[PDB]
């Protein structure tokens, strides 16, 4: 049994960050040197480990989180960061142990005229806790009069589309992100 990393990285469609995907990786042998030693990933940052020595380590079991965000937001997917993505979408703990991988996906997730399928959470009154997933679509009450389910003044939809176009500057282009969180059932070769 070899770990199903192709199903995570090479998946046809990715999740939106507010509804990020989480896959458990259990009782398989994992090759991380395939991942680190390539030209593919513009971000490949490891915390608590070295990318060099990823194969010769064992974990209780591993989680592969994945989603799509714009490029200049990929820096929010690190321990200690703040911002709309880190505060209201996907939050890493301060003591995170694992690796954060991200590559440009303009050729997969961009559409002419705008891909409005990917969304992020814009409004929220408290920050998410580490590894929280919030998928509520309640109207956001920014004033005192209750909203009663209809957008208007001081009543906003909490989610916003990215609208990825192939002609955007690459800072605004979609990036696919995989976060690897690290008995014992998941080992290297």
């Amino acid at each position, epitope marked *: 049994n070899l770990c199903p990393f192709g199903e995570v990285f090479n998946a046809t469609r990715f999740a939106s960050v507010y509804a990020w995907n989480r896959k458990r990786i259990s009782n398989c042998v994992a090759d991380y040197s395939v*991942l*680190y*030693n*390539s*030209a*593919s*990933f*513009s*971000t*490949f*940052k490891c915390y608590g480990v070295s*990318p060099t020595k990823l194969n010769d380590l064992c974990f209780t079991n591993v989680y592969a989180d994945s989603f799509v965000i714009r*490029g*200049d937001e990929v*820096r929010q997917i690190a321990p200690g960061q703040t911002g709309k993505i880190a505060d209201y979408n996907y939050k890493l703990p301060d003591d995170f142990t694992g690796c954060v*991988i991200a590559w*440009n996906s303009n050729n997969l997730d961009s559409k002419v005229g705008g891909n409005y399928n990917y969304l992020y959470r814009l409004f929220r009154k408290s920050n998410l806790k580490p590894f929280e997933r919030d998928i509520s679509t309640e109207i956001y009450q920014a004033g005192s009069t209750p909203c009663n389910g209809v957008e208007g003044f001081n009543c906003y939809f909490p989610l916003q589309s990215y609208g990825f176009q192939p002609t955007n*500057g*690459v*800072g605004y282009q979609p990036y696919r992100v995989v976060v690897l969180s690290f008995p014992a059932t998941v080992c290297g070769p």
Partner: nanobody
Amino acid sequence: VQLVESGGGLVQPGGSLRLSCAASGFTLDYYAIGWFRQAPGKEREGVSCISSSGDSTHYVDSVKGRFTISRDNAKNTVYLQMNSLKPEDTAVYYCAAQSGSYYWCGSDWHEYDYRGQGTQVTVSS
């Protein structure tokens, strides 16, 4: 954490410069470093990148034979040797550092996280 460029300035057509990007606040081992140029009134373009592996990729045709990018992990700096300089080469040169996979190099400025504030290279004629 800062990236300071140096070694540029005024130079004659045919002369050479040696650009130095000195990085502080972090070590450059896992990072790929790229050199970019911004000509008068345009947006930045990638000139050449070296990866964490130490491998090079040059993105401008004009510059393949002439420029050579080098890395020094012990002194924490990266070098761009520019030979056979031309008036076309006049620009503000920036360097940038990005922590990617081993062989990753990027032509695109907005895909590096750490950026320098730039140094001017002016060639006469």
